[PDB]
Structure 1
Amino acid sequence: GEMKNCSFNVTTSIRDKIKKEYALFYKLDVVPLENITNYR
């Protein structure tokens, strides 16, 4: 469909520790910049 399986870096409850999270969102919410799709 118009959804994309995105990965990203979000600072958890603790500021020092960083966790890579996967979450859904609808189309047009992100725009391209660059094997793997790399955008902002």
Structure 2
Amino acid sequence: THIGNITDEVKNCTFNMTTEIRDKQQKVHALFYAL
């Protein structure tokens, strides 16, 4: 909100990922295509 739009093809995904230190994980997000 901030021929056709891509709101039905892009999904907002939150997950955990490894940092450069193995003991801590970071919660991040990315926009992925549904395919």
TM-score bracket, shorter-length normalisation: 0.5 to 0.7
Q: Answer with 1 or 2: which has the greater Rg.
A: 2
Greater RCO, 1 or 2 (C-alpha within 8 Å, sep 6+): 2
Answering whether residue 31 of structure 2 is matched by residue 19 of structure 1, we say no
TM-score (norm 2): 0.63
The percent of aligned pairs where both chains have the same amino acid is 64
Answering whether residue 18 of structure 2 is matched by residue 7 of structure 1, we say no
Give the paired residue count: 28
CA–CA separation in structure 2 for the residues paired with 1:9 and 1:18: 6
More strand by share: 2
Give the C-alpha shift of residue 8 in structure 1. 0.3
